[PDB]
Amino acid sequence: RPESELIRQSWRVVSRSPLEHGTVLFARLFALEPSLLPLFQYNGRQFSSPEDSLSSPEFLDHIRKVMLVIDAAVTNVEDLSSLEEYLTSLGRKHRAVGFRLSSFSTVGESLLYMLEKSLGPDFTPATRTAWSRLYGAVVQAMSRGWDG
Ligand code: HEM
Helix, strand or coil: CCHHHHHHHHHHHHCCCHHHHHHHHHHHHHHHCHHHHHHCCHHHCCCCCHHHHHCCHHHHHHHHHHHHHHHHHHHCCCCCCCCHHHHHHHHHHHHHHCCCCCHHHHHHHHHHHHHHHHHHHHCCHHHHHHHHHHHHHHHHHHHHHHCC
């Protein structure tokens, strides 16, 4: 559609600087859901405060991964069936880390925030709506790693 392009166009801006943008996504996410923070367990140490996470290179790496999955979702915005099977298994990985199912919606409100703050006025409600459809779909796929 033209929604696919709303997405492509918004993303444009964000993949200039994906860590920086994802840094935003995650800080927002911890602000909204602090109980997520212990789920990263690099060396079986638990970050004590959000800012600790920002000093973890493993964590920053997880940001890069997040943004690359999202990036794959944008590339395939036309048909997200092509990455259903990947995303399903990726949801399974997340099941295993202790991630609740409810927590996806936060991750999604985090991404939106991040887009909204990056695009300011360009972040029109058709844009909120498109991303939300995209991310909604990513989660649908991901949720099938809780299958039942
Ligand atoms: C936001 C809450 C999330 C938490 C708390 C979380 C946590 C984790 C943890 C602990 C791992 C394992 C360690 C690591 O690879 O660095 C992991 C792996 C991964 N996460 Fe997340 N994650 C979250 C969301 C996401 C989201 C939304 C995505 C993608 C859109 C994502 C993509 C990945 C990827 C790609 C891996 C590597 C998976 C593999 O083994 O293939 N994560 N995540």
